[PDB]
Structures are given as C-alpha cells and as structure tokens.
Amino acid sequence: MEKQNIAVILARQNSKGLPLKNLRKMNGISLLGHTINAAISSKCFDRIIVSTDGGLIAEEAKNFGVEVVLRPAELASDTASSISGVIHALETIGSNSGTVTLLQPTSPLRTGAHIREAFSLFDEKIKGSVVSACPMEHHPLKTLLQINEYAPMRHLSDLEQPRQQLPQAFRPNGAIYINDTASLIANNCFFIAPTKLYIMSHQDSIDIDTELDLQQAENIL
Amino acid sequence: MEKQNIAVILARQNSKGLPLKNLRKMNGISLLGHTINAAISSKCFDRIIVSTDGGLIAEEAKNFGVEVVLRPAELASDTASSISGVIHALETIGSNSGTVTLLQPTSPLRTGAHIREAFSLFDEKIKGSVVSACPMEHHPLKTLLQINNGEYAPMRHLSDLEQPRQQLPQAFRPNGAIYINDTASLIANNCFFIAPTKLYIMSHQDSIDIDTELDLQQAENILNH
Ligand SMILES: Nc1ccn([C@@H]2O[C@H](COP(=O)(O)OP(=O)(O)O)[C@@H](O)[C@H]2O)c(=O)n1
Ligand SMILES: Nc1ccn([C@@H]2O[C@H](COP(=O)(O)OP(=O)(O)O)[C@@H](O)[C@H]2O)c(=O)n1
C-alpha cells in the first residue's frame, strides 16, 4: 500500500462548553471550516478526513470538499479518547502507511502555513512526532507537586532562579500533532519519541472553549 | 539576642513597568499601604520594616507607623536580588534570630488573615519555609524543555503529555505574596526556599500580582466586589 499523508479532523457534534461548538462561526466561517481550509491550503495532505457523530457536522464537511467518516456514539462520548478516534478513522479508510496529522477545530488561528512549516520538521527516517507548542507564561520548573506535602519540580534552587538561567519551556497547544502512521497505530498515542516541536506564538495558539475565546480570536483576525 | 518575628517589605521607589508603582493607589490606599496594613492586622510580627531607596516611599511607610531601612542604589537596582535586600534589612536592624517574612507590595489582595494562616503552618522546630502559592492553569508536567536550539525533552515522562490532569499530581507555583523563614536559616542558606518547604495555598484571585495598569484595575474590581 502506497504511503499517504492523512489529515484527521475530529469534530464530534456536541461539546461540554459551547453547544455545537465545532459549527460556531468565526468571521462567518465555522471552526470546522477554518481547520479544513488550513488542511487544504497547506497542501501537505493526500487525504483530509473529518470524523464525526452528527449529520450537521457531516453536511458542513462535505460542503468543504473533504471526506467524512461517521463515528459511532461510543467513540464520540465525553469519555472517548481522541486517539481511539484517529485509529477508527484510519481503519475506516484503510490506511496504515505514511503520516497522520490530528487537526483540532478548536485551534482556528492555526493556518495552512503553520501546518506546512510544522511538516518540514517531520523526520521520515526517525519518525518522531512533530507537535505544535507555545511558550509558557509561568515556568514549569518553578513549581511544586503535591505528594503528601509538596516537592519541587526539580531543585529548590530552580524556584529562585531567573528565567534566563533556566531552559526554554514550551507546552503543546493542541493545534497540530503529526506522526508516522504505523508508529501511531503501534504506540496508540500522539507523542512518539523523539518528539520535535513547532513553536507558535500565544496569539495563534488560541484554543476555543468559551464564548469569550470566540470573540477574542475573532478580533485577532 | 531574643527571637523576633520580622516582616520585610522591599519597596523600591521607581519601576520600569508602572511608574512609582508602589505608591499607586487602589481604592484610596497605595499598594505599599495595603501590604503594610496586612502585616499590621496579621499581628504576626514584632517588627515591620519597609526597605526602600526613595523619600516618597519612606514618608509613606512612616505614616503607617512602621520602620524604614534605606537601601544603597546597588541593592535597589533592576538586577538586585530580593534576598540581598532582605539580608541587608536584617543586618541594618541587627536581627539574626526568629523569623523573617518577605511581603511584596505587588500582592495587594494578600491580607492580614492570609498571613496569619500561613504562619500557622510554620514549624519552629523543623524550620522549613512557608511560601504562598496558587494552582497552575497549565500543568507543568505537560511541557518540554529546550536543550539545543531545535531539540526538546519532556519535563518528566513523555506519556505525561497525554495523561489526564486528574491522574497527575496537583501542581502549584509560588505567588510572590508570602515567604516565611527561620531567620538563622535564611541568613545561612541565602535563599527563600529551605527544605522542607510548606505551601500555603491561595486562590488565583487573591494571588493577583501587580505589574500593569490593567492588573491594578482588576485588583480594584475584585475589592469593589
Ligand atoms: N473524543 C473526542 C474528543 C474530542 N473531539 C474534538 O476535538 C476538539 C478538541 O476538544 P476539547 O474538548 O479538548 O476542546 P477544548 O476543551 O480544548 O476547547 C473538538 O473539536 C472536539 O469536538 C472529538 O471529535 N472527539
Ligand atoms: N530588589 C528588589 C526587587 C523587588 N522589589 C519590589 O518587589 C515588588 C515586585 O518586584 P517587581 O520586579 O514586580 O517590581 P518591578 O521591577 O516590576 O517594578 C515591587 O514592589 C518592587 O518594588 C524591590 O523593592 N527590590
């Protein structure tokens, strides 16, 4: 089977917070539409799949010229893991070789340009993940974890060390997760060593969860 | 020398962020004043010292009935560490025994009661630090550190990145509001974090740090509630 670069956009219809979140408009285009446009304008994929449980999401995806995979309710529940979602999608279309990229619609400021640049980091030989990430406001080394009562993340001295003396800290932003397809299937997870990062600014890393996020991101445009 | 509980409030007059920040009023009382009030109302200290480099700060502190320590330009510079400022305060008044507490004027919502509660955690036998902290929005284990230009490594486990928050140890970060230490220990260690460090948990709201004009508004809004 020839290798294929597949984009999987998990877009279940219901959302804890904003109802019908994936269909909420931002500048007149649904979140789903924005991510779909990013996938298309990136030109990094041979196949773009939108996986969902509802007819309304399906209809929207189709209008955008991409493929639709219908997820069973069980795989679209609040306790349904995204990894199981992506595995089901790859099995449905029968692909197990190439690359598979998860693109969440909740990261509407992530553009095709972003995806493409993140793709240039993927190493075909090593096959580690390429995950988009953004800088941390509060440095993770200057924290403590409860154990019962608390212990420093690393050293106590870290808590008094100025940023410049400490390593650069970054956190995944959920916009992009690129992996070698066979590796993701074998590992059953999105982070595969050696994981590489694609750095995105705080602005473009906005993640839609509330009505406020929607307006905020609608302004950044 | 008899033991004394000392409160040190480092308040340089100038700020490259918010001009004359420590003198900026919030609901009629300067940031400095709010922190002095918290130190006084806590009733946890035998002495309250405000360390500064300027006359306007000193005058303000005096109006509150507390002691003033004058810092050399070098200890008030933008690179001067807070610990060197506290050491200097203790040396100036001559205290090297009891407890010393740093109370930053930039945490106006940290009250006298907050301080009192934090002190209840201090163990004068073990002599470990008591630092106020608040929960993290983003879990610190769900991060990676840069090693070499374009190479990174996870904080701990690569698997932690995908682990559900509920299944990870609760994380906290010092909020800069309170640091309580045995004085002898602080002087010998020359740092604010001494094992075993206990945390006094505070909410995000009460942990507001003042760095910008907006923070000041948010702080006044929270009070005006
Ligand atoms: N089992 C799942 C889980 C999430 N998702 C989708 O993945 C995206 C991110 O989910 P999320 O709950 O983390 O969104 P936020 O809480 O980050 O705002 C949304 O478009 C969800 O509908 C899905 O299609 N299936
Ligand atoms: N060496 C130092 C460091 C901090 N501080 C005070 O501690 C608080 C927090 O420091 P900061 O770094 O946010 O003050 P800025 O340098 O941002 O103006 C402020 O009230 C400062 O004036 C001080 O008086 N001396």
What does the model show?
Chain A: It comes from Neisseria meningitidis. Chain A: Pfam families: CTP_transf_3. Two copies of one chain form a homodimer. Chain A is α/β, with parallel strands linked by helices. The first copy, chain A, has one domain (2-221): Alpha-Beta Complex (Spore Coat Polysaccharide Biosynthesis Protein SpsA, Chain A). Chain A has six helices and eleven strands. Chain A has helices spanning 31-42, 55-63, 82-93, 112-119, 181-187, 211-220, and strands at residues 4-10, 25-26, 29-30, 47-52, 67-70, 98-102, 130-135, 144-146, 150-152, 169-180, 196-199. Chain A has a seven-stranded mixed beta sheet with strand order 5-4-1-6-10-7-11, sandwiched between helices. A two-stranded antiparallel ribbon of chain A has the order 2-3. In chain A, helix 1 crosses helix 4. Chain A is globular and about 55 Å long. The interface between A and B is medium-sized, with 34 and 35 residues. The structure holds cytidine-5'-diphosphate (CDP) (2 copies). Residues 10-12, 15, 17, 21-22, 76, 80, 82, 85, 104-106, 211 of chain B line the site of one cytidine-5'-diphosphate.
